[PDB]
Design a protein around this ligand. Structure first.
Ligand SMILES: *[C@@H]1O[C@H](CO)[C@@H](O)[C@H](O)[C@H]1NC(C)=O
Ligand SMILES: *[C@@H]1O[C@H](CO)[C@@H](O)[C@H](O)[C@H]1NC(C)=O
Ligand SMILES: *[C@@H]1O[C@H](CO)[C@@H](O)[C@H](O)[C@H]1NC(C)=O
Ligand SMILES: *[C@@H]1O[C@H](CO)[C@@H](O)[C@H](O)[C@H]1NC(C)=O
Ligand SMILES: *[C@@H]1O[C@H](CO)[C@@H](O)[C@H](O)[C@H]1NC(C)=O
Ligand SMILES: *[C@@H]1O[C@H](CO)[C@@H](O)[C@H](O)[C@H]1NC(C)=O
Lengths: 38, 241, 277, 38
C-alpha cells in the first residue's frame, strides 16, 4: 500500500502544485514527509 | 433520484418499448446480463422497478453484480442472479454547476460492508473511532461544467425483470404484420395457428368473441385482432392422387 | 334467514369462443338451478366468497355501488374495492380496512380507513349509476380475477323474476391477490334494497346456442333424471324409449380393522425403571 | 491510526472548494476515497 498511497498522494501534491496554492500543497507534502517519519 | 436517494419506483401492467432505445443511442454504455438485449423486447414480466441517479463518471465502469466501485459500495449495490439490465450515459450537460454541485453528498466508508438491495440512509459524519474526532470528513460531489473525463456526472438507470406468482408479463408487441387472403398460408394469430385460405366471413359475431369453431372442434372463424373484423379459415386443397 | 330460491339466473359464457347453432357441453363452475339465495335490506354483514359467487340487486335504488373482497381483510394482505363516482370508475389493490360499517345525500369514500401501500389503480367507463337489474358474478381461477355482467329490465317489485338471459364479460383483471371472504357495499342515509348471494360448484352443463350465436338457455344435468338423459343424448328432444345414463356406488361407512387378541409385550419400562447405571 | 490526517486532507480540498477550482477538490476527494478503501 505504501508505494501506491505515496505515489497517489504525491500526485495530489503535484496537482495542487499546478493549481496555485503553496500552503496546502506544502501541507499535504508535510503529511507525506510524515509517512516518511511514520 | 440520486445514489443515496434511490427509489424502487413502480412500473407494471404496461408495455414499454425497449429496442427503439438502442437505435436511439440515448444511453451510451449499454451492458447487461440475465437476458440478451434483443430478446428482452420479446419476453419480460412484472416487477419493473427502476432507478435514475447521478454518478461521477468514474465509478460507472464497475456497476455490476458483486463488483461495484467502492463509491457506491454503500450508495447502491447489486447481487448476482440479477435478471434485468443496467444502462447509463452522460449528464454533464446541465447536471453540473460552477464551483461544483455540492448539492449532493456521497457516502464514504462504514465499519461494515453492505449487502445488495439495502443501504444506510442517514447523515454520515465519519467517526475516527467509537466517537468522531472530538468535525466532519463527509464529502459532497462537485461538478463544474468544465469537469474532467472521468468525472462527468453520468446518467444512469437500472432495470428489474423478475416475476412473483402474480400475472401480467407486460412485454413488447409483435409490431403487427400485414394480413393476406386468397392464398393458403401457415397463418398464426395471437397464439392460435393453423393453415388455410382466409376469406370473407358473413357470420356476424358479438363484441366479445375472440374466435369461432362450429362442431367437432374445427377452427373456422377468427376475429382479426387488428380491426375486430371477421376472418374465415379453411384447410385448403389436399388429398390423394 | 331471508333465503330465496335461485330459479334460472346464473349462467355465463364459459369462454370467449363462438359457436353457430350447435349443442355444446362443458364442465365449469355454475350454480344449481332451483337453489337457495339469501337477501336483506337493516344491514348486510360479511359473506365468505368461497370459490365463485353470484350477485343481484333490487329496483329503484343505487345505494349499493360495488363490492370488496379478500381473505384477512386488513392491511396484512392486499385487498380490493370497486366503486364508481358517476363519471369514472375506480379499481384498487388499496389497503382499506373493514370498518364496523364500510359504507358511504353523499358521504364519499367514508369507507376509507387507510389508503396506504396500494399498488394498482384502474380507471374506466361505467356500467350503471321500476328499473334494471344487476346480474353479475365473480370468480378467481388460475391466479386471475374475473367478471360477468349484463344490464336487463326488471319489474314485479316483490322479488326475483322468471325468464332467462345470457351473461357477459366486462374485462379480465390480472390482480392475483387472495380472497376468501367479502362484504357488500351499502350505505346509511341521514335505503331498503336487496342483495343476493349464492355459491358455485363444478357441475357440467349443456348449452344451446341460437342461430346468431347467443346462449338462449341451457340445462344442468344433475337436477333430475329427465335432465340427466338430455345431456347423455346431446339434445332437448328425448325420443320415446329407454336409456341407461350412469351408475352409482353405495359407499362404505367406517373401515373397521381387526388384529390379534392381546398385542402387548416386550418389557421396556423396567429398563428405564431400573435401579442403577 | 485515526483518520485525522484524512480529515485535514478533506479540509484542504474544501478550502480549495472555497477557492473555486471545482475539479481539483474533486480529484483530492477521489484520492481520499482511495486511501480510505486502501
Ligand atoms: C332452501 O331454503 C328453504 C327455506 O328458505 C328450505 O326449506 C330448503 O330446504 C332450502 N334448500 C336448500 C337446497 O338450500
Ligand atoms: C407494503 O406492503 C408490502 C406487501 O407485499 C410489504 O412487503 C411492504 O413492506 C409494505 N410497505 C409499507 C411501507 O407499508
Ligand atoms: C394465498 O395465495 C397462495 C398462492 O398465491 C395460496 O397457496 C393460498 O392458498 C392462498 N390463500 C391463503 C389463505 O393463503
Ligand atoms: C340475428 O341477427 C340478425 C342480424 O344481426 C337480427 O336481425 C336477428 O334479429 C337476430 N336473431 C334474433 C332471433 O333476434
Ligand atoms: C381373546 O379371545 C377370547 C376368545 O373368547 C376372548 O374371550 C378374550 O376377551 C380375548 N382377549 C382380548 C384381550 O381381546
Ligand atoms: C415405571 O413404572 C411405572 C409404575 O410404577 C409406570 O407407570 C411407568 O410407565 C414405568 N416406566 C416407564 C418408563 O414406562
Amino acid at each position: 500500500d505504501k508505494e501506491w498511497i505515496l505515489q497517489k498522494i504525491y500526485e495530489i501534491m503535484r496537482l495542487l502544485d499546478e493549481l496555485x496554492d503553496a500552503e496546502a500543497s506544502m501541507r499535504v507534502s508535510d503529511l507525506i514527509y510524515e509517512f516518511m517519519k511514520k | 433520484a440520486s445514489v443515496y436517494a434511490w427509489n424502487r419506483k413502480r412500473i407494471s401492467n404496461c408495455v414499454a418499448d425497449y429496442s427503439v432505445l438502442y437505435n436511439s443511442a440515448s444511453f451510451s454504455t449499454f451492458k447487461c446480463y440475465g437476458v440478451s438485449p434483443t430478446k428482452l423486447n420479446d419476453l419480460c414480466f412484472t416487477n419493473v422497478y427502476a432507478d435514475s441517479f447521478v454518478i461521477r463518471g468514474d465509478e460507472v465502469r464497475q456497476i455490476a453484480p458483486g463488483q461495484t466501485g467502492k463509491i457506491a459500495d454503500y450508495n447502491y449495490k447489486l447481487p448476482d442472479d440479477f435478471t434485468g439490465c443496467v444502462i447509463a450515459w452522460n449528464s454533464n450537460n446541465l447536471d453540473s454547476k460552477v464551483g461544483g454541485n455540492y448539492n449532493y453528498l456521497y457516502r464514504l466508508f462504514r465499519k461494515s460492508n453492505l449487502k445488495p438491495f439495502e443501504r444506510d440512509i442517514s447523515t454520515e459524519i465519519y467517526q475516527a473511532g467509537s466517537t468522531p474526532c472530538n468535525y466532519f470528513p463527509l464529502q459532497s460531489y462537485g461538478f463544474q461544467p468544465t469537469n474532467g473525463v472521468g468525472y462527468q456526472p453520468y446518467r444512469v438507470v437500472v432495470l428489474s425483470f423478475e416475476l412473483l406468482h402474480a400475472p401480467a408479463t407486460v412485454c413488447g408487441p409483435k409490431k403487427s404484420t400485414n394480413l393476406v387472403k386468397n392464398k393458403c398460408v401457415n397463418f398464426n394469430f395471437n397464439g392460435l395457428t393453423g393453415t388455410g385460405v382466409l376469406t370473407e366471413s358473413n357470420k356476424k359475431f358479438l363484441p366479445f368473441q375472440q374466435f369461432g369453431r362450429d362442431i367437432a372442434d374445427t377452427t373456422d372463424a377468427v376475429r382479426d385482432p387488428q380491426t375486430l373484423e371477421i376472418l374465415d379459415i379453411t384447410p385448403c386443397s389436399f388429398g390423394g392422387v | 334467514p331471508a333465503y330465496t330460491n335461485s330459479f334460472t339466473r346464473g349462467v355465463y359464457y364459459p369462454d370467449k369462443v363462438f359457436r353457430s347453432s350447435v349443442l355444446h357441453s362443458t364442465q365449469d363452475l355454475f350454480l344449481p338451478f332451483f337453489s337457495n339465495v339469501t337477501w336483506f335490506h337493516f344491514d348486510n354483514p360479511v359473506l365468505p366468497f368461497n370459490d365463485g359467487v353470484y350477485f343481484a340487486s333490487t329496483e329503484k335504488s343505487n345505494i349499493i355501488r360495488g363490492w370488496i373482497f379478500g381473505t384477512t381483510l386488513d392491511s396484512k394482505t392486499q385487498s380490493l374495492l370497486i366503486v364508481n363516482n358517476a363519471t369514472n370508475v375506480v379499481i384498487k389493490v388499496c389497503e382499506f380496512q373493514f370498518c364496523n360499517d364500510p359504507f358511504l345525500m353523499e358521504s364519499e369514500f367514508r369507507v376509507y380507513s387507510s389508503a396506504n401501500n396500494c399498488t394498482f389503480e384502474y380507471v374506466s367507463q361505467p356500467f350503471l349509476m321500476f328499473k334494471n337489474l344487476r346480474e353479475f358474478v365473480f370468480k378467481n381461477i388460475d391466479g386471475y380475477f374475473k367478471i360477468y355482467s349484463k344490464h336487463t329490465p326488471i319489474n314485479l317489485v316483490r322479488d326475483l323474476p322468471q325468464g332467462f338471459s345470457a351473461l357477459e364479460p366486462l374485462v379480465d383483471l390480472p390482480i392475483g391477490i387472495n380472497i376468501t371472504r367479502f362484504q357488500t357495499l351499502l350505505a346509511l342515509h341521514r335505503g331498503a334494497a336487496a342483495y343476493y348471494v349464492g355459491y358455485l360448484q363444478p357441475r357440467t352443463f349443456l348449452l344451446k346456442y341460437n342461430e346468431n350465436g347467443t346462449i338462449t338457455d341451457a340445462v344442468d344435468c344433475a337436477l333430475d333424471p329427465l335432465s340427466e338423459t338430455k345431456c347423455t343424448l346431446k339434445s332437448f328432444t328425448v325420443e320415446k324409449g329407454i336409456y341407461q345414463t350412469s351408475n352409482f356406488r353405495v359407499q362404505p361407512t367406517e373401515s373397521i380393522v381387526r388384529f390379534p387378541n392381546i398385542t402387548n409385550l416386550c418389557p421396556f419400562g423396567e429398563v428405564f425403571n431400573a435401579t442403577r447405571f
